[PDB]
Design a protein around this nucleic acid. Structure first.
Ligand SMILES: [Zn+2]
Length: 464
RNA sequence: CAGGUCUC
RNA sequence: AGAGACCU
């Protein structure tokens, strides 16, 4: 992805978009009970912690574009994935607007507690002034769709969240691209049924883990991904995507039966306009974060990428022997013979992708079940039932989360959620966690899950 | 002050 | 009808 131009909002006729600049994060009652290094992200050009220019760091993720049109490998890769998806009989028919706005069994309703985006936000028009869960009306939405159209610019905001101490200094806070309500509705009308299919089928047919529940999905993964594992990290995956990958997505969508009207929306994702503050800018390539379908489309593109890297890097690859799941840019894959990602990453550089070792070393070392991570979680066989696999969120991440809060009124839920993640690291680690929690007065006032109850509830998901 | 998934 | 966890 690459910024094509920047213009003042006076020249483009767009309204200003500034957004909050003070974090909602505050040190919690546990801030000094646990060690951690993260702090609230830089949200302002004049944050005293900065050590470089903010805006430059902010937009550095747009590293440029390499290829614009698919080569032989990307074409083969897209067609192999599209063929695989065919066995799901995805309904390519337009979803009803009533269902696109208000949801189905497998598609959550549009979030009514968030902004409606351009231009509604600057006009003080909330989503609840157009949509109504009880009434399930679409007359008002249809009116505002035809009034304001589609391809409305995204509103850029800096994401208020914890960041490591290095990304505080380097200004590397994350951006979110607030979609317009209109575009969300139209994207959900067009691809709603694909979203349903994907949400209902996390695994190696979709090649996607969106919709997985790790408590039970982890036990399936060693069976879905037999053989030798390989994985790696992307730096700034979304923003690094060249236009070739959206062309490749078009190939996938057409081959599974999408009408030319449906497939023509991908260029609206490849080529987007954004309002940050008092300026409008154009982005060519790069997936917008904050668009309907971001997770799923990023995961679909990744399935194309892994396939194409393999058949371009190595001779004699059989794509039918690849196994993989992707959650956006996060990937865990298997193949009958070991795969050298040092070579995958060189090929990836040609495609404009920056890939680094999974263990965060400078060297690409073997990935196996004892060091693989996915959605930041490790894989740990149960001690009693070794076919049942614990997802292990590192205690270090749990410590970072517990040290801060955005609303201390919900401390008990926050801690309970972390306990639900933490017990998977075993009885000694869990008891040490609860006992540290209990070493301060708020901690003694909390209902904390008992470890034996946690383990028993988890076993009951499997009936064993 | 976005799009999602998961869980209480 | 709420909350928290997690991914972009
Ligand atoms: Zn443009």
């Amino acid at each position: 992805g690459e910024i094509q131009w920047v213009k003042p909002n006076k020249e483009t006729g767009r309204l200003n978009i500034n957004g909050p600049t003070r974090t909602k994060l505050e040190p919690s009652v546990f801030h000094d009970v646990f060690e951690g290094n993260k702090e609230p992200a830089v949200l302002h050009s004049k944050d005293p912690r900065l050590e470089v220019d903010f805006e430059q760091a902010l937009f550095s993720k747009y590293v440029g574009n390499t290829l614009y049109e698919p080569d032989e490998y990307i074409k083969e890769a897209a067609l192999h994935y599209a063929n695989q998806l065919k066995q799901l009989d995805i309904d390519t028919s337009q979803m009803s607007m009533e269902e696109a706005c208000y949801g189905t069994e497998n598609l959550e309703a549009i979030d009514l507690h968030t902004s409606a985006g351009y231009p509604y936000s600057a006009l003080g028009i909330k989503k609840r002034d157009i949509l109504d869960s009880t009434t399930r009306d679409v007359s008002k939405m249809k009116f505002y769709m035809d009034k304001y159209g589609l391809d409305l610019p995204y509103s850029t905001y800096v994401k208020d969240e914890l960041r490591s101490i290095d990304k505080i200094k380097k200004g590397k806070s994350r951006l979110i691209e607030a979609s317009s309500l209109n575009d969300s509705v139209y994207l959900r009308m067009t691809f709603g049924h694909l979203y349903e299919t994907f949400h209902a089928n996390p695994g190696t047919v979709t090649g996607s883990a969106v919709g997985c529940n790790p408590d039970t999905f982890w036990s399936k993964l060693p069976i879905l991904l037999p053989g030798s594992l390989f994985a790696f990290d992307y730096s700034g995956y979304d923003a690094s995507l060249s236009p070739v990958w959206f062309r490749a997505l078009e190939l996938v969508l057409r081959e599974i039966g999408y009408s030319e009207e449906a497939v023509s929306l991908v260029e609206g994702i490849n080529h987007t306009h954004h309002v940050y503050r008092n300026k409008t800018y154009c982005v060519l390539g790069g997936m917008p974060s904050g668009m309907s379908g971001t997770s799923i489309f990023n995961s679909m593109i990744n399935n194309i990428i892994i396939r194409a890297l393999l058949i371009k890097t190595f001779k004699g690859i059989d794509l039918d022997e690849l196994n993989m799941v992707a959650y956006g840019d996060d990937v865990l894959a298997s193949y009958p013979f070991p795969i050298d990602c040092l070579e995958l990453a060189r090929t990836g550089k040609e495609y404009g992708l920056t890939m680094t070792p999974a263990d965060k070393s400078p060297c690409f070392n073997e990935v196996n079940w004892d060091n693989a991570t996915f959605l930041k979680r490790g894989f740990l066989p149960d001690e009693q039932f070794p076919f049942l696999i614990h997802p292990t969120m590192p205690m270090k991440e749990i410590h970072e989360s517990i040290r801060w809060t955005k609303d201390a009124r919900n401390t008990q839920d926050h801690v309970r959620s972390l306990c639900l993640l933490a017990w998977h690291n075993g009885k000694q680690e869990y008891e040490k966690f609860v006992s540290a929690i209990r070493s301060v007065p708020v901690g003694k006032a909390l209902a904390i899950p008992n470890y034996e109850n946690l383990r028993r509830n988890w076993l009951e998901l499997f009936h064993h």
